[model samples]
Target: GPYQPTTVNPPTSYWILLAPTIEGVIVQGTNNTDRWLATILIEPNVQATDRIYNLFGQQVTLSVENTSQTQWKFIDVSKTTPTGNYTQHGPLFSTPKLYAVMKFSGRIYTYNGTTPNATTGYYSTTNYDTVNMTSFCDFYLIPRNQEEKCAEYINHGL
Candidate 1:
């Protein structure tokens, strides 16, 4: 079944953010309908303590304190739906390493040591990004209701 962002009110919304080239993902929660509760970033490549992706061969990590603001945050996305069938698939969030999360102001954050900072990150934030990288990327606006299914799909696809 399709998901609707209405299971919980204002303070319980969730979102999934992804960056393919960087091979990163963030699972964010929000108390406010349009605000983020917490930010979690997952990176498959991180090279150094201060430098991410410094070498050709590196392991993945998750980082929250080090992440910077990026377009993928969906801060200014239009609330109004455009005319047409605008449904999308669900996305799953996970990591090979286990870590704890810290919540702040109704927001929690998590990142592994290898997660790269946002300053040198790349990901699609609009239709254009996916359109241009169709061969290797895709964008889907999954419903809050279908998160489980989406997670299954994402996990299997990965």
Candidate 2:
């Protein structure tokens, strides 16, 4: 699990974190506004699961770029989906999957194969810093409220 501090803070209803694999770097942004954003690249003109968690611990839509490359602004989120008593959420990236990228030394470059691994090896752009993989934006349509999280978890068919 990428989450740290080790304390358990589970979402009672249902929650998910559409994060990149271990090979992907978290490209930390400025301490303000854009800090909570993730830039991922999905297949051009195709559907992708671009949703992710924000600094406020809420789900938000990944803003899209309509030109040459697909640069998602923000955590790259969208609205929520509901099934049963819980709300469902997942990113819609083009397959066969993708990962995050970072500027040398520490910065986010991309997260959907715009640059994208696993040691499941988790590499850090910084002096420090891993997920499994199935697909990049392979998350969508979770009607059971089963609590889907990152690309690694989905690889297990969660």
Candidate 3:
């Protein structure tokens, strides 16, 4: 995980904005940790999953793992599918899976295309002071009771 404590209390900041055709917004944060774990989230659009890729073209997929009243669970899509089959699907939008780019980790990962799970990697982004964490979004048919919250969760799914 990219989260770790350092000099002081972890920094917490947030912002909101409207876009003409964007699904999510980018906010800036103060670097209060030697290594801060940033989580990005946007709303859900379809039943499919969202895929994330590192600079090296290595890919990872995350999807809703659970949904309660106020919280929804998200895990690597491979948890529900075959690892080798995960990356076969291309960029989140390049395919017709109908996924809203909701949320993403601000940090990047180091991947070794070989071993499925035993690989170790490092964080891609450490300067929250200089970069923006961006993600995607889409509309989902959430149940009425959990609609608003779900919408917020999906829209903010990082």
Candidate 4:
């Protein structure tokens, strides 16, 4: 199905922007790879605060870019996809903020910002930051249509 540029993911749509919370929580280790990422836009997606990742994975700090935009397209990729196909998971809108989002294995954690830390092994904020590092959060990349359920396992502590 094709979607025109809108400001939000329709709650009743085939895919929805369900979880990842305002604090943005979703560990990548769950290994559920049938999901997408996006930020709810109040405007058409163009704003100084609005952000997206470049193909090379650099964060661009946009207008109504929408989920269909290159930075905000379909996501849910994994080990098989590699770094070239998708933007490195980041923490702009949290774990790779976009006017919308694509697939990811984002590990939103302590550290800060989008780019992963290369100098320190455990210092960066994303999973594919260094590709050389090979990292993942146990459940950072949430699955589609199972968000409320996604809250169940998170009851462990959050």
Candidate 5:
């Protein structure tokens, strides 16, 4: 949802980076070379259905609606891509499944926490770890500099 139309058309390539933080999951859009474009914080919403809300108030419903994908689908924008290979075990407080979206060369990949979906027009991977928000890797797993940038953005905005 953070994407917009600029006066000039830059190159088109899909790239994203994600990391779990004390507040929530930090998602950052990048330009393949690790330059972060935008950042968002995703947290669970209080409801009967599985859903998470972004800082901008966008709600993404989780897999209860689509058992086939086993992950939540981001709505609204098109240029944004999904990266990361994890899931947050649902039912709210239990093991907290994890899921991730990563974009590479214009292809979006969804990583399923339970079991990643197979590739069709995009790629997918089941190889990822599911950890508690507090226990998630914030240093080595994600680039320390990028995580710091996300933190800076969070502090400045939220």
Candidate 6:
């Protein structure tokens, strides 16, 4: 399911901003190859946060905030990932790409203040900027592909 943005005022037609989020899966083990990453774009001073969840919808991981704009990479990939591909199975199967999701939050104007000239029938403007309110958690994703490039690094026989 996805979240829908809406505004309180009918005429003003305000809408909540939704940031982009990305998620992907890759092979596991030394049979590593190409990879892909996902991210979301957030506005300045929006106070956004992210959390990664597993198949069971449980919070499994959290990414470090890069504040350098909303950008996230999962596979740390190089090259590109296969379009319609799946990791080999059986004993030979070492690992497979996992899954991830990102979440972003921002602010929105939900109310307005009283106007100083109310006596003159100057009602406060609905959905005014002065009534700055915050919105939170709009999740999205970017799709990418990559190829296996490397495995494990070791010093021969430790």
TM-score per candidate: 0.27, 0.24, 0.22, 0.19, 0.27, 0.18
Name the TM-score of candidate 5: 0.27
Better-scoring candidate (lDDT), 3 or 6: 3
For candidate 4, the 10 contiguous residues with the lowest summed lDDT are: 114-123
Give the Cα lDDT of each candidate. Answer: 0.25, 0.28, 0.27, 0.26, 0.29, 0.21
Q: Rank the candidates by lDDT, best first.
A: 5, 2, 3, 4, 1, 6
What is candidate 3's TM-score against the reference?
Answer: 0.22
lDDT of 3 by residue, 8-71 (tens): 2221222222121222221112233342122322333434555353311334444422222332
Q: Per-residue CA lDDT of candidate 2, range 80-148, in tens?
A: 122111122223333333333222233222223221122112223222101111222322322214322
Task: State residue 132's C-alpha deviation in candidate 3, in Å.
Answer: 8.9
| Stretches of candidate 4 exceeding 4 Å from the true structure | 1-18, 23-64, 67-81, 87-158
Clashes of each: 11, 27, 18, 24, 14, 22
State in Å the error of residue 21, model 3.
4.2
Error of 3 at 94 (Å): 24
lDDT (tens digit, per residue) of candidate 6 on 41-122: 2222223354343311223343323232232222211112433222211111101111222111211111111111111011
| lDDT score of residue 106 within candidate 4 | 38
lDDT of 4 by residue, 83-137 (tens): 2233333222222322122222333222122222211012123342212111111
